[PDB]
DNA sequence: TTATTTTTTTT
DNA sequence: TTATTTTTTTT
């Protein structure tokens, strides 16, 4: 039901992949551990999903789909790209 | 056409009401000057009109029309009442 | 051929 | 009679 537990449980799973040991030796090699962690995905609500994406990624997406060109996207994304930097205020 | 000139012209009119002199004496008494300035009004766009209103005034309005009671108003007005304090960022 | 930067307000 | 504080996501 709760986001706080979805994220907590996901982190515990990654931790378990890190530190699970059998006969006293760590169960997975590093390439293996990166493999399993690759398979897990987490799906927040849309707004938080956006705010997770770094500016480089989203700019890359805008370029790749040439959506960098049209005005409404650029104005909107500029405003959002800004507020991040002062999201420390809960009101922001 | 331009807001910068509407506000500039209004301020010049108030200044003229202040300092217009006839035969070397100031044309209007203080109660007169407050009278004329009472008659002038200025009508910005809606958003700036809101941001001019002090929190006390808008809270008084919300109370007088009991709109203080309903949730959407309070959430929205709280958010706006906040951002003002950090409107120094143009992005905000 | 001609050859840019622009304002305002509301939904 | 019974007697509150609550989460999440999208439009």
Short mmCIF file of C-alpha atoms (C1' of nucleotides) in Angstrom, two decimals:
data_model
loop_
_atom_site.label_atom_id
_atom_site.label_comp_id
_atom_site.label_asym_id
_atom_site.label_seq_id
_atom_site.Cartn_x
_atom_site.Cartn_y
_atom_site.Cartn_z
CA UNK A 1 0.00 0.00 0.00
CA UNK A 2 2.69 2.49 1.02
CA UNK A 3 5.56 4.04 -0.94
CA UNK A 4 7.78 4.09 2.13
CA UNK A 5 7.66 0.30 2.22
CA UNK A 6 8.04 -0.25 -1.51
CA UNK A 7 11.30 1.65 -1.50
CA UNK A 8 12.46 0.10 1.76
CA UNK A 9 11.75 -3.40 0.48
CA UNK A 10 13.54 -2.76 -2.80
CA UNK A 11 16.61 -1.53 -0.97
CA UNK A 12 16.56 -4.59 1.26
CA UNK A 13 16.46 -6.82 -1.79
CA UNK A 14 19.50 -5.12 -3.28
CA UNK A 15 21.25 -5.40 0.07
CA UNK A 16 20.40 -9.09 0.17
CA UNK A 17 21.83 -9.56 -3.31
CA UNK A 18 24.99 -7.85 -2.07
CA UNK A 19 25.59 -9.75 1.12
CA UNK A 20 23.98 -13.18 0.84
CA UNK A 21 26.60 -15.80 1.64
CA UNK A 22 26.63 -19.58 1.26
CA UNK A 23 29.14 -21.79 3.14
CA UNK A 24 30.69 -18.51 4.27
CA UNK A 25 31.41 -17.20 0.81
CA UNK A 26 29.50 -14.40 -0.96
CA UNK A 27 26.94 -16.03 -3.18
CA UNK A 28 27.34 -13.81 -6.25
CA UNK A 29 30.23 -12.34 -8.17
CA UNK A 30 30.23 -8.65 -9.00
CA UNK A 31 29.10 -9.14 -12.58
CA UNK A 32 26.40 -11.44 -11.25
CA UNK A 33 25.32 -8.88 -8.66
CA UNK A 34 25.13 -6.23 -11.32
CA UNK A 35 23.11 -8.66 -13.43
CA UNK A 36 20.47 -9.29 -10.80
CA UNK A 37 20.25 -5.63 -9.85
CA UNK A 38 19.75 -4.89 -13.50
CA UNK A 39 16.59 -6.99 -13.46
CA UNK A 40 14.92 -5.14 -10.63
CA UNK A 41 13.02 -1.99 -11.48
CA UNK A 42 10.99 0.40 -9.34
CA UNK A 43 7.99 2.37 -10.53
CA UNK A 44 7.10 5.50 -8.56
CA UNK A 45 4.36 7.94 -9.37
CA UNK A 46 4.96 10.06 -12.42
CA UNK A 47 6.06 13.26 -10.71
CA UNK A 48 8.68 11.59 -8.57
CA UNK A 49 9.74 9.56 -11.59
CA UNK A 50 10.48 12.79 -13.40
CA UNK A 51 12.33 14.36 -10.50
CA UNK A 52 14.63 11.36 -10.29
CA UNK A 53 15.89 11.87 -13.83
CA UNK A 54 19.10 13.85 -14.06
CA UNK A 55 19.18 16.86 -16.36
CA UNK A 56 21.62 15.14 -18.71
CA UNK A 57 19.28 12.18 -19.19
CA UNK A 58 16.21 14.27 -19.83
CA UNK A 59 18.08 16.60 -22.17
CA UNK A 60 19.31 13.52 -24.03
CA UNK A 61 15.73 12.31 -24.34
CA UNK A 62 14.54 15.70 -25.56
CA UNK A 63 17.27 15.74 -28.19
CA UNK A 64 16.77 12.15 -29.30
CA UNK A 65 13.07 12.73 -29.89
CA UNK A 66 13.86 16.30 -31.09
CA UNK A 67 11.35 17.53 -28.50
CA UNK A 68 14.10 19.99 -27.55
CA UNK A 69 12.81 22.14 -30.42
CA UNK A 70 9.31 23.18 -29.39
CA UNK A 71 8.66 26.11 -27.11
CA UNK A 72 6.23 24.75 -24.51
CA UNK A 73 8.55 21.87 -23.64
CA UNK A 74 11.53 24.17 -23.26
CA UNK A 75 9.75 26.73 -21.10
CA UNK A 76 8.24 24.04 -18.90
CA UNK A 77 11.42 22.00 -18.59
CA UNK A 78 13.43 25.12 -17.85
CA UNK A 79 11.13 26.05 -14.99
CA UNK A 80 11.24 22.55 -13.56
CA UNK A 81 15.00 22.29 -14.07
CA UNK A 82 15.22 25.37 -11.95
CA UNK A 83 12.98 24.59 -9.01
CA UNK A 84 14.95 21.40 -8.30
CA UNK A 85 17.84 23.50 -7.14
CA UNK A 86 15.69 25.09 -4.45
CA UNK A 87 13.38 22.16 -3.68
CA UNK A 88 14.76 22.31 -0.12
CA UNK A 89 11.75 24.39 0.81
CA UNK A 90 8.87 21.88 1.17
CA UNK A 91 6.59 24.53 -0.30
CA UNK A 92 8.73 24.58 -3.43
CA UNK B 1 0.39 48.71 -24.92
CA UNK B 2 3.05 48.05 -22.27
CA UNK B 3 2.77 47.39 -18.54
CA UNK B 4 6.02 49.22 -17.85
CA UNK B 5 4.43 52.42 -19.11
CA UNK B 6 1.07 51.95 -17.43
CA UNK B 7 2.75 51.73 -14.06
CA UNK B 8 5.19 54.52 -14.85
CA UNK B 9 2.40 56.82 -15.97
CA UNK B 10 0.31 56.08 -12.90
CA UNK B 11 3.21 56.89 -10.63
CA UNK B 12 3.80 60.14 -12.49
CA UNK B 13 0.18 61.09 -11.99
CA UNK B 14 0.42 60.51 -8.25
CA UNK B 15 3.65 62.50 -8.19
CA UNK B 16 1.92 65.31 -10.06
CA UNK B 17 -0.92 65.30 -7.54
CA UNK B 18 1.72 65.58 -4.82
CA UNK B 19 3.80 68.40 -6.16
CA UNK B 20 1.67 70.54 -8.45
CA UNK B 21 1.90 74.14 -7.29
CA UNK B 22 -0.05 77.26 -8.23
CA UNK B 23 1.28 80.78 -7.48
CA UNK B 24 4.08 79.00 -5.63
CA UNK B 25 1.84 77.16 -3.21
CA UNK B 26 1.02 73.43 -3.31
CA UNK B 27 -2.27 73.05 -5.09
CA UNK B 28 -3.86 70.43 -2.85
CA UNK B 29 -4.13 69.85 0.87
CA UNK B 30 -3.25 66.47 2.31
CA UNK B 31 -6.85 65.34 2.65
CA UNK B 32 -7.40 66.52 -0.91
CA UNK B 33 -4.33 64.64 -2.14
CA UNK B 34 -5.54 61.51 -0.44
CA UNK B 35 -8.93 62.09 -2.04
CA UNK B 36 -7.62 62.26 -5.58
CA UNK B 37 -5.27 59.33 -5.07
CA UNK B 38 -8.24 57.41 -3.79
CA UNK B 39 -9.94 57.84 -7.16
CA UNK B 40 -7.13 56.38 -9.21
CA UNK B 41 -6.99 52.62 -9.58
CA UNK B 42 -4.65 50.35 -11.50
CA UNK B 43 -5.60 47.02 -13.02
CA UNK B 44 -2.77 44.56 -13.66
CA UNK B 45 -3.14 41.05 -14.98
CA UNK B 46 -4.70 38.60 -12.59
CA UNK B 47 -1.56 36.86 -11.39
CA UNK B 48 0.25 40.04 -10.49
CA UNK B 49 -2.95 41.34 -8.95
CA UNK B 50 -2.93 38.37 -6.61
CA UNK B 51 0.73 38.69 -5.74
CA UNK B 52 0.22 42.30 -4.72
CA UNK B 53 -2.29 41.36 -2.04
CA UNK B 54 -0.80 40.99 1.42
CA UNK B 55 -1.47 37.78 3.32
CA UNK B 56 -3.60 39.61 5.86
CA UNK B 57 -5.91 40.97 3.17
CA UNK B 58 -6.35 37.68 1.40
CA UNK B 59 -6.89 35.81 4.66
CA UNK B 60 -9.50 38.41 5.57
CA UNK B 61 -11.23 37.81 2.25
CA UNK B 62 -11.12 34.04 2.72
CA UNK B 63 -12.66 34.41 6.16
CA UNK B 64 -15.31 36.93 5.12
CA UNK B 65 -16.53 34.66 2.34
CA UNK B 66 -15.82 31.60 4.57
CA UNK B 67 -13.70 30.24 1.71
CA UNK B 68 -11.11 29.60 4.42
CA UNK B 69 -12.99 26.37 5.12
CA UNK B 70 -12.56 24.27 1.98
CA UNK B 71 -9.49 22.18 1.36
CA UNK B 72 -8.46 23.06 -2.21
CA UNK B 73 -8.36 26.77 -1.41
CA UNK B 74 -6.26 26.20 1.69
CA UNK B 75 -3.75 23.90 0.02
CA UNK B 76 -3.41 26.19 -2.97
CA UNK B 77 -3.20 29.39 -0.96
CA UNK B 78 -0.69 27.82 1.40
CA UNK B 79 1.59 26.88 -1.48
CA UNK B 80 1.34 30.34 -3.00
CA UNK B 81 1.77 32.03 0.38
CA UNK B 82 4.99 30.13 0.61
CA UNK B 83 6.61 30.69 -2.75
CA UNK B 84 6.35 34.47 -2.29
CA UNK B 85 9.02 34.27 0.36
CA UNK B 86 11.46 32.79 -2.12
CA UNK B 87 10.27 34.51 -5.30
CA UNK B 88 13.76 36.03 -5.51
CA UNK B 89 14.68 33.24 -7.88
CA UNK B 90 13.16 34.23 -11.26
CA UNK B 91 12.44 30.56 -11.84
CA UNK B 92 10.31 30.52 -8.70
"C1'" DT C 1 13.50 37.25 -53.03
"C1'" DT C 2 14.73 38.55 -48.19
"C1'" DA C 3 17.57 38.00 -44.35
"C1'" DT C 4 13.71 39.39 -36.18
"C1'" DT C 5 12.74 40.96 -32.03
"C1'" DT C 6 8.76 41.27 -29.98
"C1'" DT C 7 4.74 42.40 -26.37
"C1'" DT C 8 -0.14 41.13 -23.28
"C1'" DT C 9 -3.64 38.38 -20.95
"C1'" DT C 10 -6.45 34.21 -19.96
"C1'" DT C 11 -7.46 29.38 -19.91
"C1'" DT D 1 -25.78 6.42 19.31
"C1'" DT D 2 -20.79 7.60 18.81
"C1'" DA D 3 -17.18 10.70 19.47
"C1'" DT D 4 -10.44 10.53 13.31
"C1'" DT D 5 -6.37 10.20 11.30
"C1'" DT D 6 -5.36 8.76 7.17
"C1'" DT D 7 -2.64 7.17 2.65
"C1'" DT D 8 -1.71 6.93 -3.20
"C1'" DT D 9 -1.84 8.29 -8.02
"C1'" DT D 10 -3.63 10.67 -12.19
"C1'" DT D 11 -6.15 14.14 -14.65
#
